[PDB]
Design a protein around this ligand. Sequence first.
Ligand SMILES: [Cl-]
Ligand SMILES: [Cl-]
Ligand SMILES: [Cs+]
Ligand SMILES: [Cs+]
Ligand SMILES: [Cs+]
Ligand SMILES: [Cs+]
Ligand SMILES: [Cs+]
Ligand SMILES: [Cs+]
Lengths: 181, 184
Amino acid sequence: GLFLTLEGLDGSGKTTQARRLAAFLEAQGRPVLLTREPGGGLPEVRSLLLTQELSPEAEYLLFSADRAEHVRKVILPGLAAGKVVISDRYLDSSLAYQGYGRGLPLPWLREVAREATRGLKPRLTFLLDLPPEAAGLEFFRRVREGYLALARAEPGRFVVLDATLPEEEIARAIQAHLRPL
Amino acid sequence: GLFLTLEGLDGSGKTTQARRLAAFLEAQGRPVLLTREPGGGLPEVRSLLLTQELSPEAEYLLFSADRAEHVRKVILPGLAAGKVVISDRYLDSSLAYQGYGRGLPLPWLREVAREATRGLKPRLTFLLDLPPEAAGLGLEFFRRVREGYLALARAEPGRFVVLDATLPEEEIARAIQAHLRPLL
Ligand SMILES: [Cl-]
Ligand SMILES: [Cl-]
Ligand SMILES: [Cs+]
Ligand SMILES: [Cs+]
Ligand SMILES: [Cs+]
Ligand SMILES: [Cs+]
Ligand SMILES: [Cs+]
Ligand SMILES: [Cs+]
């Protein structure tokens, strides 16, 4: 199997590009599982995450519970069956939003995640980099820059794309990075 | 403020004793806040934990999110106001059930907890100990939990007070009072 994720602010186009990728790979003959966070593990998490004035720790722990179930019950079984599994959002979303955005310590985030994810990391992550005003502007600037920080740190895994480019051009770039895999 | 917890199997009497402890403290003119886990932070987590079959990891993390909210929105504010806060269940429930019971690694559980709880530990925890039969194949999980609680207690004898929960309710209550009185 092959694990791929898409990341970015809401309205960055990462959702569009996840489905375009899923359809492209399917046309190459490859079995695909398209999924998303939050809700891919525990659909009821989407309710809890909207709680008024939720602490950043509680918000991250809810994302993590969802992720734990998502990895165990959906993603790992899909990879085991030889599928390309594509998730619209994964752990980097939490690192960018709860870590860089809300100020939680990244090492704690990663330690929680290590059991939650069983260490599962995608082979490639396509980050759609969107100017924060096109998404709490201060918050969104922190999240945007946090994503870029994550990408600088794991340049093997991240492919950073300009989300202001036409949808078709971004899809072609994504396809070009995959062809060799 | 003073933070106290009660622990044990469901049907151990922990809930009755949490109520009697709050009553004792009220009779001493001490402001008291009685609370509980799960659901004291995020009520929907309790609802989910009742109906959903989850991995042990996901179960723990949901309990942890509830606990994070409970600590920040209920317990710490109670303690800040100078109340004695009594929780019916706290972190030791997760360690015994999800750690000893379901098999999750205890160091990881405690690393998660460290930020979730902001390091807040109770001054005393009253463990209402009894065999699961006093609260065939289903008993093995509960035996693990029981022995897990006892393992926790013997590792922190300064914090834990272990009571024989099969004793009459008034005798247990009087034992809890006697242990608490030096925190006068
Ligand atoms: Cl999007
Ligand atoms: Cl009880
Ligand atoms: Cs890359
Ligand atoms: Cs675009
Ligand atoms: Cs916890
Ligand atoms: Cs602290
Ligand atoms: Cs003690
Ligand atoms: Cs009893």
